[PDB]
Amino acid sequence: FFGAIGCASAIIFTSLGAAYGTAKSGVGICATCVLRPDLLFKNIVPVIMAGIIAIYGLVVSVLVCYSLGQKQALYTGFIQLGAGLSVGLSGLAAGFAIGIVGDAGVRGSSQQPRLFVGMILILIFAEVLGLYGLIVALLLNSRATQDVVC
Amino acid sequence: FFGAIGCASAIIFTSLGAAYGTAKSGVGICATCVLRPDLLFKNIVPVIMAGIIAIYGLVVSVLVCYSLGQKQALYTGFIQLGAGLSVGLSGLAAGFAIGIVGDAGVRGSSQQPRLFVGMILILIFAEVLGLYGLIVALLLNSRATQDVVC
Amino acid sequence: FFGAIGCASAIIFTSLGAAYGTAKSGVGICATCVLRPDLLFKNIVPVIMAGIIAIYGLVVSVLVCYSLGQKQALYTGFIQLGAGLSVGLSGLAAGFAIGIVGDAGVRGSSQQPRLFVGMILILIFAEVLGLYGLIVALLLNSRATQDVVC
Amino acid sequence: FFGAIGCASAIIFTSLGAAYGTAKSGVGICATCVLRPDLLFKNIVPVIMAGIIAIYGLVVSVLVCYSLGQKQALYTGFIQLGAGLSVGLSGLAAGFAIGIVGDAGVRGSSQQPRLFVGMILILIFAEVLGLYGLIVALLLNSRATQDVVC
Amino acid sequence: FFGAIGCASAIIFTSLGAAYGTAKSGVGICATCVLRPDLLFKNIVPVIMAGIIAIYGLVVSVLVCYSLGQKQALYTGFIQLGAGLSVGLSGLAAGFAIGIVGDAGVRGSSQQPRLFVGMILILIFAEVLGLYGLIVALLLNSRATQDVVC
Amino acid sequence: FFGAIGCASAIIFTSLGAAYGTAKSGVGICATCVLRPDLLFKNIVPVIMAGIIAIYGLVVSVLVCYSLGQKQALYTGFIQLGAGLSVGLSGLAAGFAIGIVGDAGVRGSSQQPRLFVGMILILIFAEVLGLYGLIVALLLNSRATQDVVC
Amino acid sequence: FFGAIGCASAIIFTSLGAAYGTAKSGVGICATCVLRPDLLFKNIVPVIMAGIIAIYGLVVSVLVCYSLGQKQALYTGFIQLGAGLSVGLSGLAAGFAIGIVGDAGVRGSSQQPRLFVGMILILIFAEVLGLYGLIVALLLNSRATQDVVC
Amino acid sequence: FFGAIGCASAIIFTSLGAAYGTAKSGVGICATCVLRPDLLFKNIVPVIMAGIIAIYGLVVSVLVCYSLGQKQALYTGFIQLGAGLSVGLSGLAAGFAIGIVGDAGVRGSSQQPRLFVGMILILIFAEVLGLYGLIVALLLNSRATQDVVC
Amino acid sequence: FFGAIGCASAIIFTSLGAAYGTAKSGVGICATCVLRPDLLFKNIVPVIMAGIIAIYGLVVSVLVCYSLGQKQALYTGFIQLGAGLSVGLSGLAAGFAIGIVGDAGVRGSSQQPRLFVGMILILIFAEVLGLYGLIVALLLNSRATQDVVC
Amino acid sequence: FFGAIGCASAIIFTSLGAAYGTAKSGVGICATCVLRPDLLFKNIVPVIMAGIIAIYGLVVSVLVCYSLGQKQALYTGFIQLGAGLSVGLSGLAAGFAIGIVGDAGVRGSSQQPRLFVGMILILIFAEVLGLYGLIVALLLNSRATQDVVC
Amino acid sequence: MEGVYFNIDNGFIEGVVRGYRNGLLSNNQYINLTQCDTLEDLKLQLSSTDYGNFLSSVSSESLTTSLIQEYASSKLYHEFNYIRDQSSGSTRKFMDYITYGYMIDNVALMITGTIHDRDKGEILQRCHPLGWFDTLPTLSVATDLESLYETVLVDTPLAPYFKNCFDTAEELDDMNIEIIRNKLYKAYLEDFYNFVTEEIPEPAKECMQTLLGFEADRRSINIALNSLQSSDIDPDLKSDLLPNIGKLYPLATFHLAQAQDFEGVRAALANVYEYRGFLETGNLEDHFYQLEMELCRDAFTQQFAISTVWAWMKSKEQEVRNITWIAECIAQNQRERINNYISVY
């Protein structure tokens, strides 16, 4: 229906995002690990930062399955649709930004061991959008399916 | 029908904007930390600025939800839709602008710490835009709720 | 109706115009500021020309919101449409213009300080379009508010 | 309806024409201005030409606006449509040309005072397009409401 | 109706062609003035060449303006459309050829003032194109017109 | 009426062709004349070779115009439309070849000016491409002409 | 109908094919005449290879005319349309190949005119693509006529 | 019906992603194998990571097949279709991320054998998407399906 | 019909394949021929393979001509159509493979003329695609045959 | 009938897939061949990898042909359609991936002809994607069986 | 924005370059190497790097002239020649063009060299796409412009030389060493600009953009300084005038290039540039190096970018030269003139 498109939107956009993010960050880490094999552990927190975003998004998608029927009212659909969008594209956008910063920051790490935590700060801000979108989306979806009175 | 699209515009565009903002700004900090590794504290104050736009986009959306039905009306449909647009594209544009200037501005930070507030004078011009959208979106909602009747 | 979309149009076009202005200018200003810290105050005075564009747009938008009907047909819809467009296009066009001149104009600021007033003159000519849009929009608004009527 | 698009046309296109004309010439003007702070007056002349285009546009807009309405005949609608376009795109094209030659012309003021008059003459040839549109737009205005919206 | 669009096509393309021409040629003249500053009287003739198309264009337009009715037919209708087409896009082809040629020919003039007449002679070869377009529109236009209601 | 659009097309596309041929040629010629000015006379014959294309197009138009009437039935229209295209787009395509070779052979003239005629012959080969197209349009037109169903 | 469009597709694709051919070769030739001004008699022949493709084009076009139905059915049109396509694009694709090989071959003549004869064979092998399509085209056309308005 | 297409689209994308990854990763391994073939065994693990997603794709496909209905509606159609998207795109984006990390990680291995395991860990961040995507689709499919006319 | 568009489809795509094939190799051939003068014989054999594919292409076209009825079913149409696509596009891809491989082989030819058989052996592998489509097209064509009126 | 299009799908996508592979690998064999003509045997093994993909498709295609009836239900079409799709686009993705790994590995051959065996193993991993699409199409066809899928 | 694209081809070129940068001489090493005067210590620092492979081969505590040249030649083969061949797409092309642009100065000098008459065989190292065994001699024997054009068409991909030859027909390049080289450089920098412009939308140029402009400004002021008090022909482009975004102006470069003394320009230009205008030829030379040395390292902060690999190549040329300069002084127990004095890499 429209709720099935909701499910689609959520599981596609947040993976597509997270995937870029992890990729980007990853490549930067691959450079850093051969230069000093000690910054390995510090490197692990940027790459995986985009990794916790994903696991959130996936949870909303699962939700939506349970909320799914075979054919349902238009009103139940369109809210279901718009919710799934939300966590999906905020997931998408957060996942992207964090990877770009992240990659460049791992080189920063390489020259400045001390400042691993500072690269991290930048990343954490871009996460508010993703985390806030998960929240909102989860609550919407659950409330949405009640078959009218969404 | 139009309620979902109200949702979509707002929750995408304002996330992307903000995301963009964090990204470019981040890129600049990671470049600068190798020349001066003690400018974090001043730099972070641009970074957090872009983050409040999304939280707005999402409150606007959750309202648009309540304002839809299923009887429909072109007239009511059009106000929920027209409401989303305002915040999405202002969010998106404030965000794009703010990260470009930000990026350029951490270089600014590197060579001339003392006039750091001047970079900020330029940034705060983009955030006016988000207010302009927010204000109008909020009002638009107050009309919008009637439960799709002409 | 088409009036609420009048709003919607205004906030997308004029936000994007100003964004572009600040972004472009930003990069030229930040660059110059490291070669010389003393042109800050001069340099900002261009940037603020595109920043007040959005604020004349905000006046038109807020006005239309309170004047929005509870039933609206073609006659209201469209004249509110046209008003929105008007601030929308001047904000769009001018914002764009200010940032290109402003940008090149920092090169002016830098080498000659006292031809700062000459830069202004160029910038003042893009502002003509800003006025023209806001005026038409107000005239459109006044006629516009009538409610119903096909 | 088409009345509404009629007003819309005239004010949008002419303002782009103008906006662009001002930006493009600006880049050239700023550049010259620092190497010769005595040639300020000459430099001023290309840019201010494109400002005058907007004002002819602006007269048609206001004229057309009084005659605006969806409650009125197809004859009024269509007459407003042809009128809008006519000044709208001829105006755009006069601004484009004024603005390119405007940039290009800056070298001619500076090196050769005497043949500054050739630049000006080229611009003058590009103003015919506006007139050509304006003339037409008026007559059309005259059919809607007698003696050019008396 | 279909008549308003004839009126428009005509005035829009012919304006844009004449602009392109004039602009491109202008650029050339301006370089040539500082390269050899006595070729003034020679330079002037290329630019103004483009824009003399508009005067025959004005004629068809004023005819079509008076000939608009409340409604028209499809069959009659389309002859008005198709007539506008002819002048505009022909005017466009004539203008484009002349403006590229225009620019190139002033380089010729610059180095060799002896082949000055030969440069002109190329422009007039592309001008004939424009001539034929007016003609073909004229035949169509004549039959289509019959004042109110065609 | 759709026949009008066959007439319109024929004169547009072909003229565009001639234009394209002159544009390209022009730039090559003007360069050749500053390198060697005694080759003027030779140079001038190729350019004016493009635009004899225009003359076949005009005849096609004129014939159809007089047979058109004000009301046609559908089927007579569609045959006329299709006639117009054949010459139109062959014309445009003939202009491309005539111009490209046109350019290249005047620069060839400069270095060795004996096979200036061999250059010219290649251009004449490309005039067949218009001819066969032009030809069919006559045949098409004669049979199509009856008006109000064949 | 769609049959008149048949005539059209053929005459256009094959024109385009042959222009390509002539264009590309032509630039090569023009290079070769200043290296060798005596092998021109040989160079000329590659051009005519692509020129014979159109002469095949015309027979189809003429064919479709004669077979045009009374009002034509939807099915009658498509056979004719499809035939225009077959020949046109097989001509275009053969036509493309002949200019590229042609070009490399003419510089081929210039250095070694003894193995210019190897080049001739390759050039002839592209003419077969055009032939198979011309064959097919015949067949489609011939089918249309049998059991009139097929 | 509409379920079969689901099966189809799903298994294709995930293959596409995985193929891409397998290539990416392979090119990096093939360069390194002629520079040090002592790492064959370690290298084999990154390339193979991509494709194990694809064996989950096959499982979902077969299950859906067994549950197919003869005729389906739109609403029901959309869930079976949509389910195929879920796995397909989580696949597509994961497979891509992995192959970029995979190529970059062979350099990591090459200089530092011991931190092979640190490369492996980046890759496992993308396997999460694959699993969860598979899970979700399974559910959407199960509900829609109830066998023979869903 | 859709049979006719099937005819077109086969002969047009396979002609493009060979066209590009013939071209690509041709350029390489011309080069090799003016620096070696005994590898002409070898050369001849790569090009001529891509001429034979089209002949297979021609056959499917003809077959489809005969199966094309008068007012057939869409259901009939699709089998004839689908058949054509299959030889055309397999032809097209087979062609890309023969020239790219081929081209590189002429340089290969130059240094090692004894490994002539080796270059052949690669080229043969592309013939599989042609077999694969041609065979299937045949079976489709035969069955599709159902005379006039379905 | 949609089975015909099934056959069609498979033969376009895989043919494209193979061509890309074949193209890439062969260019690498030719390079290697100049150096060593004793490595003939080793080089053939990378190119042959792409061609075998299409032979799995041939099996599937021929199957579908024989299964075609002029009594097929909509559900029968879709199974054949969905199956054809699966191998075409799996075929696409495998073929491409083999061509990248294949080309590079022939260069590996060139540097170390002892590690020809390493390249084999790398290639077989891209082959797996090709199997999992083939597999599902075969299975689907074969299970569906309604008097051998008519 | 960079890394907003998925590339098969970019992934290969970027990793292989990073793989070399690991063993590559750091800023700290060069700082340590100037301090040295001990024969053994120079060996140790270097043994460990990409250059160290060649050093191990023949063990020499005092490094002569020949040894250093042989090691650098070996090192450009693995790093530049090879890489291109296992790279594909737009990324291989970008590497071919940078290598070929360096080749155009070398090959140009060889051709010009035939006119003067000169001895050839092995020619001194530069980054060239193919060695002196392939391309450079084939080009060298054609001194006839007509045959030059034909010889470039054989090279697939094409060299820039094809355009350069068109130009020398119409005599916009004149004769004599100094003027030719100035025009060859002007083209060289022009080609850099066209590439960035096409390339920018998926991998942005930030770090690369600032470095490309600062490189351009330095190259041009240097050309001008050279032709200051040595004779300068004013209508020729021996002032190296080329497009700019306004960091260096045509006017200010022209003033320096002619023989009228225009040292002032350098000082007005600098506000953060190392070269500030001096009376010491030698001190100017030092500064030029350090400026062009900075911002390459900054470019490494970016990754997955066309920006990264470009900046790395240009740093490599400056490192091969530093190695030579330091190594020779320490060998015969002297300290460096230029390298000991510079202290920012």
Side-chain angles (χ1 to χ4, degrees), chain A residues 20 23-24 27 30-31 34-35 100 103-104 107, chain K residues 1-6 18 21-22 300-301 303:
Chain A
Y20 267 93
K24 288 186 253 87
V27 174
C30 300
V34 286
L35 313 171
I100 303 157
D103 187 342
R107 203 65 192 188
Chain K
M1 305 307 259
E2 51 277 295
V4 280
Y5 64 108
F6 272 133
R18 288 177 297 154
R21 204 192 317 174
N22 303 331
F300 304 137
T301 306
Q303 214 69 260

Side-chain angles (χ1 to χ4, degrees), chain I residues 108 111-119, chain J residues 29-44 110:
Chain I
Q111 284 307 308
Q112 292 254 9
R114 50 179 272 191
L115 210 73
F116 177 39
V117 295
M119 308 295 178
Chain J
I29 297 169
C30 302
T32 294
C33 294
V34 306
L35 295 174
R36 261 167 282 178
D38 55 76
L39 291 179
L40 185 52
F41 296 81
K42 309 189 195 287
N43 290 331
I44 298 166
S110 181

Side-chain angles (χ1 to χ4, degrees), chain A residues 27-58:
Chain A
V27 174
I29 301 177
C30 300
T32 310
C33 296
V34 286
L35 313 171
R36 277 179 63 84
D38 320 84
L39 299 177
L40 190 49
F41 306 115
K42 305 180 186 68
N43 304 330
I44 287 155
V45 179
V47 61
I48 212 184
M49 199 107 303
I52 49 157
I53 310 175
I55 304 294
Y56 296 138
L58 295 170

Side-chain angles (χ1 to χ4, degrees), chain E residues 55-105:
Chain E
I55 311 297
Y56 296 138
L58 180 60
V59 185
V60 165
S61 305
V62 155
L63 305 155
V64 181
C65 298
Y66 283 128
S67 312
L68 291 186
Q70 204 160 272
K71 288 153 169 82
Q72 289 174 227
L74 320 172
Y75 311 89
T76 315
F78 276 146
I79 312 183
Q80 293 289 27
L81 171 50
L85 283 164
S86 292
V87 191
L89 281 312
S90 60
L92 182 68
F96 197 79
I98 287 184
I100 318 304
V101 176
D103 185 50

Side-chain angles (χ1 to χ4, degrees), chain H residues 1 12 15 19 33 55 65 69, chain J residues 75 78 85 93 97 115 129 132 143:
Chain H
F1 191 73
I12 285 162
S15 275
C33 291
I55 309 180
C65 306
Chain J
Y75 182 54
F78 284 122
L85 279 167
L115 299 164
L129 308 306
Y132 301 149
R143 291 172 277 121

